[PDB]
Assembly symmetry: D2
Homo-oligomer: 482 residues x 4
């Protein structure tokens, strides 16, 4: 369902509400502190020592209050950065609600980040403290010998019942629109660190709630990367809408086929890989799901979805929705909803297929995807050098090459770094045609860029004799050939 | 083709630019005065006595100067309203350009307005002046017996070579964003008076251009009704773009077929009534291939006959341009209150809200409705009218829940795509639910009218009725059955 | 004393709050219904037949509920304008709360508007209803012969205990920022009808409060004309701040000197004439020590009243220091202004523009003039009226250069301090220069007046002084 | 004089105008490239080897196009930062006008910054190249051994006639509102490096022009610190209004008295000190040209126009003294008064903030805080000290103050300088320099733990402590 007129107006009239104070406002809207709101997978160990399967609004306020005082006692003050090295969406979200209540910044770090690289990334942030769990803690104590070290490398088990008494007197913190609440990192291709504020992280959400969109009470299962800006924006968003949120730390398509069947969620958030794993695996009940929300680089037919019939009345079409979202850590929210089509920019965002001089390119020509929005990061942490340089012509270059039609429908063709000059070859597009001409094809990778010419070569039941096989798909379709 | 970056940046850097100074600014961008800007129907008598078929930047700037001065000598001062009573896109355009230079307001009035209604409509505006032509001038002198009478009921022929000497010394005016430039009117259903400002009438154009949209140089044939804000909006806009504009006073399908063949426009603005007329013609060896887009502005429209005689550029799998058969059809959603289109694309799909616009399906209390639920179409946009000339009573009554009600009932898919069902007034209640006459009508491939009859049965009116289908056509409710959905 | 951080943050975090729902928000901030909020002066008769001397938040919400219902039963609907014809800040203030609750607009009309003009002023608003009292009701029935006649001409006595049941179910209305709440009218010089919205009428108040200004809890005595927009905003604003508001229907110097003694207010709002009169009394056995600020108006004015007071200052110890005499703020306003745009020698200093306002001295082509040059005062603000009701003709004609001409001529110093000289219409051209009547009157006022004899008309003239009781002109430097 | 209606409208209708395109737009408004626009003190060497005494618009555009190509050839690309290490307002301004058109950031560094610290400041910034002059260059070549080194530590003589050909084809650069143009630095610890953009650096200026303020054609003499945000805004501002700008690199009260006598300027910009030293000089000096002195940081021989009772102008004696409150991070001045700081200017919002950040009531003492789109968007490469400088939604300026009911602020002290007993040092100091005409005072002492205050300042006293203390007693303050 969609939220009531009552909650919408309460939300849109709360000039204070933002990513940094979401749970402390929910009581004031009238929610009961006994209601169940956030459903856990079992990985998360509570301070009393338990492993809760569900938290209520009040329980989450005391879990968050517990971690909060532990930090304020360990010495965390406002505007202080805390590096959080875990892999549990539940881990990051609770530390962010706590650290935000004390006015601090929860710098989320995926523990699996390549080790020698994680050290430079955390080192560069100058955080006053690290918090982690037992699997990575022994290595993170190296950071205590950093020129400017963290005050502490702690474990979550160090947060014990009653630590909340040390929480500050003016709790919770009163955020200003611009007060940082988070720092996230890029995924691969020295990760770039972007910080997010009380306002930018919820700018897209509320902008959508205001148009009458993305404002359902439907149960959502969040099996996203736990460190990623969206896992936090959707755990924060669902709680705000009153939508039962469910955290799954298992990215396996098979664990999410259990989760879909166990929790029977109406919508399911994950990355493309997760939905793929799900797609390869008849006797599964995916009846509850009406929409899959994906993001990053055929389970649909086992579902259903509501539409408007010619009677101008609801219909229960068969199959669920697959929504390919285009996002980044630095993009804050999603800026588009739908070659490979990304869709039209949403009303609180501006988009351009930019040129090398930065001039908006006309429709149909290929260029750098560029965007603008107050949902966007205000900058790279401690690194003004790289940031101002990732902008061209007034747009934030997202790092992808694309083109657009007259409606401003955009299509991702390739990564800028991945396009090849060959007397040009956008590989993600080139890859996709092959998986579409030759169904048998499970995977493809097409290999002088945006510098000089080169040559391109494929990487894909039976086999061919090779080039001649693939090169027939390209010829029919009209593309340069390997 | 798209305008150059050099021009785009100049427009987007011209904080001064708006609906009220378009022609006074193009020179400053580098436009040559010798250059041609405007192609005419041959129906306009110029001050020289001529009926020129094309005006240059410099000559329009000349002809505008004359009307401008003629007005300044008749006593028109800044912020004054002047009714233009005509039936010619071209007349409305030249008086509008002129009044704006002296700081004045051109109240467009369709002369074909019923007389006593048109008399009521102008009387309410309290204008200092009417300018019309001989077809209506004799009747318009009645307004000289209004309690607050216009200073003059003039004729266009009265504007003579050399009248420009009387225009003011600071010509051209220096408009404020909020300065009225124009007043438009609705179509019965007394019309409402929407006033548009130097900002509202250009907020939508410039916003889109900023995104790299609706900003091509292609030759446009504007056979729109001259008195609509849409006719003036696109006229001015093309001038701004460097796009060849072509005014046609004859909206007939045969007339426009000639213009398409004569001028070979890339895009054509007209009303559904015009595009339908064209589609009922041989069109065997009519060359309508120049056109890639037909732009409409309730007539619902065989149009596919016309589209198929065209082409449209697309991006193929070679990732390079590709000529494709058939031209585009854009049914834009428009009203007086909207100085641009707000929507871009089961039901007449109106489109998706445009970045500078906000749209909602609203309940009777003004509560945003969920998708699939049927309500009143509502909007918000800095392109909208700031209000009805001399009528805050009617203006405010049109706002519900914070949205401006367009008078049309609708629903929107979960993608925020809006689909028109009916005008709020035309819908019939039955003991089995609501019947939307516009949806039934367009729902057995001449005319239809799903009227109904019985009592009060309207969106607001509680009380049921029964529906009846009135079919034109000839060898005379089972099609209703063929798709969901009369006695 | 300043409002608490807890209230400030609640107000500043309340995206919904505006002139049209001030009381409906106060509870949600935590105010008690039992608390007293509005102190009246015995002129107003309540629905149950009383003449209460104070109202509580809960009881004001009850009185407003009744008027609202009575109107909702008479047929008044949302975006429907209703003329309120009275002379009482309390009448207007109460009808204004009720109409907003149903989403309607209240057109404040001062009954003492000359009849033949007052009829034209109401006719030009096409209201669905008039509400008034016995003094004027029989005459106001002429509007029943208007071509578009009000649905009803009612008396306030018709509002009976229990009419509140008829109010709408969704009471109270939910205002949009742009939703009209109020119409005010100009003195005359037909008056212009300026309409104010849920947003504009509080746009200034809220701007000021964000800054930590114009936000004290001090008790305030409003002896302003009830029909002026500022009389309603200052009422509305005081309730918002939690400050005891006190309505006085009598603007006479005696009545207000009595009120100051009875209620011992910290600040007093009135028109200049009110304050001049108080200054002419004995002021010997009077007690005006409570007052630290007089808030005032083409009438000039009174150091007697000020010396009977005090004002807190910062001493060289960096600590509070009560000092003799109370403050006088000679504020500049019009119907169109909404809030005050200027925060207060050669001329009547107008003050400095406030953060949410822009002011300019413009020429006849609308150009910005330099400091020291004389021109027409012009302004811009989100507090200003968005237009004249049913008069776009008159409205657009008051703008020059992007600015709203306030109808006055002025100059400003290099500090963008503006000084009023005269109303554009009162200035006299002469073979030797321009003469500003308000400045000249002021200068002359030898402590023992009217300078007469145009700004747009190129004709020269001669000027003459009329006293009631040219060497003084020379002394000060004038012609 | 005020600028014309024509320039005002032209400027206010240039949505492209900002700090990074100031001279490239001035031709478009209709200025002649033959006009003289910028007056120099003689200490500047031109590419040809000349030391010009005045530059024209086109001459500025050629000298600017020169450095641009030398920089564009040396390998500087857009959004790239260049540390400029000098002491000359002319040095910094010419390099900033140039880099801006190449799209690069002119990171202004005062060469006299303590040495080992100016090393750590430049090394943190990670610049692509250094530019300096012979007096300091030999030391700046050390930065070539830093972990992430500069492409070039170059000298200004390396920019030679004809380098302008190497400028890019798309020149000048098209700035976006948020594109960086400058990095300036503070003056109580490792200086903070604040970056400024094409919109923030010029936001106050144009906001004032819009209200009809700070828009004169009057000749102005800029003897400000060459590296300071001020010295750049008034230069760009002077060029924009059409006012003859004049650079004096000598901050001595005597050198400006020579400058005010030689150039007869209408207004004079400097820091508090230059005007003070100037006060101890002379009588037989002609400062009649001057009607206003503009100061920042930390008279009877002139005239000023006022409005007389005839409502006609009146040349009064003595020039105006305007004590402005600004900082590198504040971008523009946010307060004006003619220690009263004045009222915030319309484009600025200010508060005396508590320790919880709550707007304090009038009369109580707190941290000075402000908000404006003129403010810097952050400290270069340092999002850690940046957010920590904000409290309650405000940017703490570093000063303690209080305000009256009009929002007139009075600076009392720097926050670091107030001693608990509480005694605001700058206020106490001035109190004593007013009871006793004397030289200069400095009150020391537990800051914002208790302490005891002591003093530091023609006859001499026996009990200097008995003395000073009667001033305080009468005045009403804690005693030393
Ligand atoms: N694309 C469209 N699809 C459906 N209806 C449309 C479309 N464009 C316009 N309309 C119709 O045209 C109307 C706009 O007409 P206009 O504003 O000129 O006057 P009116 O609405 O007929 O008269 P009145 O304003 O008195 O009600 C819309 O309200 C709608 O009914
Ligand atoms: N502080 C003040 N000093 C001097 N005059 C003031 C001051 N405040 C208000 N006024 C005068 O009061 C006027 C306010 O206008 P108001 O709306 O009350 O009616 P009006 O202007 O007299 O009527 P009309 O608009 O019909 O001429 C100002 O234009 C100005 O002349
Ligand atoms: N008008 C003024 N009155 C009093 N003090 C002022 C005034 N203007 C500036 N100051 C003082 O000088 C400072 C101006 O900033 P500046 O650019 O000199 O760097 P800074 O503040 O000295 O930096 P840091 O203290 O971090 O080294 C203000 O912070 C304030 O302490
Ligand atoms: Mg990736
Ligand atoms: Mg990237
Ligand atoms: Mg309509
Ligand atoms: Mg009392
Ligand atoms: Mg007035
Ligand atoms: Mg400092």
């Amino acid at each position: 369902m969609m939220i009531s007129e009552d909650l919408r107006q309460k939300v849109l009239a709360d000039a204070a509400l933002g990513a940094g104070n979401v749970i402390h406002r929910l009581p004031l809207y009238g929610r009961s502190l006994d209601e169940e709101v956030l459903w856990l997978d079992g990985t998360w160990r509570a301070p009393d020592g338990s492993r809760p399967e569900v938290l209520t609004l009040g329980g989450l306020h005391e879990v968050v209050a517990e971690y909060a005082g532990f930090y304020t006692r360990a010495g965390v003050r406002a505007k202080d950065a805390v590096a959080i090295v875990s892999t549990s969406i539940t881990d990051f979200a609770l530390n962010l609600m706590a650290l935000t209540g004390i006015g601090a910044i929860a710098s989320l770090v995926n523990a699996n980040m390549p080790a020698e690289t994680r050290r430079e990334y955390i080192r560069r942030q100058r955080v006053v403290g690290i918090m982690t769990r037992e699997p990575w803690h022994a290595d993170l104590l190296a950071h205590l010998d950093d020129d400017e070290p963290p005050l502490f490398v702690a474990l979550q088990s160090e947060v014990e019942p009653g630590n909340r008494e040390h929480r500050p007197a003016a709790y919770p913190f009163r955020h200003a629109p611009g007060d940082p609440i988070l720092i996230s990192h890029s995924s691969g291709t020295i990760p770039k660190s972007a910080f997010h504020t009380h306002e930018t992280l919820f700018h897209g959400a509320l902008s959508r709630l205001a148009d009458g969109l993305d404002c359902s009470t439907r149960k959502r299962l969040l099996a996203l990367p736990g460190h990623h800006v969206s896992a936090m924006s959707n755990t924060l968003l669902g709680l705000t809408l009153g939508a039962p949120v469910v955290h799954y730390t298992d990215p396996s398509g098979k664990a999410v086929l259990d989760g879909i069947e166990k929790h029977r969620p109406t919508i399911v958030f994950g990355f493309t890989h997760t939905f793929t794993e799900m797609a390869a695996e008849t006797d599964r009940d995916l009846t509850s799901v009406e929409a899959y929300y994906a993001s990053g680089d055929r389970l649909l037919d086992k579902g259903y979805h509501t539409a408007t019939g010619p009677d101008l009345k609801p219909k229960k079409v068969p199959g669920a929705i697959f929504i390919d979202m285009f996002g980044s850590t630095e993009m804050g929210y999603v800026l588009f909803d739908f070659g490979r089509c990304i869709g039209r920019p949403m009303r609180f965002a501006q988009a351009a297929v930019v040129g090398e001089d930065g001039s908006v390119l006309p429709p149909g020509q290929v260029g750098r995807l560029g965007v603008r929005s107050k949902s966007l990061t205000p900058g790279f942490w401690n690194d003004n050098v790289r940031w101002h340089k990732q902008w061209l012509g007034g747009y934030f270059l997202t790092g992808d090459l694309a083109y657009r039609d007259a409606a401003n429908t955009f299509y991702h063709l390739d990564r800028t770094t991945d396009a090849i000059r060959t007397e040009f070859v956008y590989s993600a597009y080139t890859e996709e045609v092959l998986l579409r001409e030759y169904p048998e094809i499970l995977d493809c990778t097409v290999v002088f860029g945006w510098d000089g010419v080169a040559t391109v070569y494929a990487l894909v039941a039976e086999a061919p004799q090779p080039t001649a096989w693939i090169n027939e798909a390209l010829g029919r379709a009209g593309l340069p050939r390997v």
